[PDB]
Structure 1
Amino acid sequence: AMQFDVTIEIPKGQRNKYEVDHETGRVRLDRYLYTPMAYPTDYGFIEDTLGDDGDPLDALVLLPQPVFPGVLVAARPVGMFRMVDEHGGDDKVLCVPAGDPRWDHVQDIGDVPAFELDAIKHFFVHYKDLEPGKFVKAADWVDRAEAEAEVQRSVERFKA
């Protein structure tokens, strides 16, 4: 199975929206969420990747226990989250701990329960509601194949 390193930024259950500066490597508090919400999974980005956005690929890792900001996690993709915000479209690869036999039952998006997909979906749609000039309008889940595809592309974009 495919594998890559994910740098976690925001731990599951956080309302503080942390970001990592991609030059200094410092953790930074972007802002406190204006809505009464909390990140449903550990949120971050895939190290050594690059998209059309300019930034690296955003990522979502399902973990038994959350971690700290800036922490590295070797993960593998089981799907991807496509959505359209006020900055056009951005993608978010759904991931699972790599080299962990406890996560062998989750091989693709269909193995991730709809309840958690619906929750993650719900979060990203509404978390910016009370921020002027910010929104999330479209959202849908796509399978491991297109996720691995988009990751394969974005690894190559980083090389050049």
Structure 2
Amino acid sequence: SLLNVPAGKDLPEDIYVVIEIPANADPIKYEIDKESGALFVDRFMSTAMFYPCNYGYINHTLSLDGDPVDVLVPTPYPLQPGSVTRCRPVGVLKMTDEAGEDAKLVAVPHSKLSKEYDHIKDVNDLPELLKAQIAHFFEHYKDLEKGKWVKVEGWENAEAAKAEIVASFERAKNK
């Protein structure tokens, strides 16, 4: 089941990301059900916005928001909901939402899957446009959902991303 996928081959530099939402998709927010391992519809988003990258999480981790830590994965073609991709973290958008601290990691496909992103070493190697679009998305996608909100602190480097991943792994390991 997706429930049994490892957090990673070599945490925090070598991770697996379970994809819930494809890049450039309709505005349906899917979540994996920790009960059944099935993809559930969480929300039909009300704003005319789309996730700028594939979106998902690292299994066996937990954010302050109560769910596994979230990850954005850019790829040359959108991924399948429910699929898993081997990734390498390069940056993180620190932010909080109405359910807890809720960082958004950016992890690129592992060089074993492609050489395309090998040149993305750290957060400043990400295109400025993409980072701007990501931040803008989290700032506004819940603009029409009463009671939900976001506050974006800011972009941090790979070292912070990795620390995030270790902290998230531990918090699941005992909580």
Output the TM-score relative to the length of structure 2: 0.86
Residue 98 of structure 1 and its aligned partner are, at CA, apart by 1.0
AA at the equivalent of 1:8: I
How many residues of Structure 1 are paired with residues of Structure 2 in the alignment? 160
How far apart are the structure 2 equivalents of 1:36 and 1:52?
Answer: 28
Among 3, 23, 29, the alignment partner of 1:17 is 29
How far apart are the structure 2 equivalents of 1:58 and 1:42?
Answer: 11
How far apart are the structure 1 equivalents of 2:152 and 2:129?
Answer: 19
How far apart are the structure 2 equivalents of 1:121 and 1:137?
Answer: 10
How far apart are the structure 1 equivalents of 2:49 and 2:66?
Answer: 27
Query: Please, which runs of 5 or more residues in structure 2 have no aligned partner?
Result: 1-11
Question: Which piece of structure 1 moves more, 93-102 or 142-151?
Answer: 93-102
Among 128, 133, 144, the alignment partner of 1:114 is 128
How far apart are the structure 2 equivalents of 1:142 and 1:74?
Answer: 21
Counterpart of 2:106 in structure 1 is 94
Write out per-residue CA displacement over residues 5-61 of structure 1, whole angstroms, 9 at most, x where no aligned residue: 100000011211111112211001112111111111100001222233332111110
Q: Verify: 1:4 aligned to 2:11, yes or no.
A: no
How far apart are the structure 1 equivalents of 2:170 and 2:39?
Answer: 26
Counterpart of 1:68 in structure 2 is 80
SS in 1 for 2:13: coil
Query: Please, which runs of 5 or more residues in structure 1 have no aligned partner?
Result: none
Among 133, 138, 145, the alignment partner of 2:159 is 145
Output the TM-score relative to the length of structure 1: 0.93
Residue 154 of structure 1 and its aligned partner are, at CA, apart by 1.8
- Aligned-residue Cα RMSD (Å) equals 1.5
Pair 1:53–1:114, CA change in 2 (3 A): same
Residues 66 and 100 of structure 2 are in contact (CA less than 8 Å); yes or no, is this contact kept in structure 1? no
AA at the equivalent of 1:155: F
% identity of equivalent residues: 45
Residues 125 and 139 of structure 1 are in contact (CA less than 8 Å); yes or no, is this contact kept in structure 2? no
Residue 158 of structure 1 and its aligned partner are, at CA, apart by 2.8
How far apart are the structure 1 equivalents of 2:147 and 2:63?
Answer: 24
AA at the equivalent of 2:166: Q
How far apart are the structure 2 equivalents of 1:126 and 1:156?
Answer: 31
Counterpart of 1:130 in structure 2 is 144
How far apart are the structure 2 equivalents of 1:130 and 1:53?
Answer: 20
How far apart are the structure 2 equivalents of 1:137 and 1:54?
Answer: 17
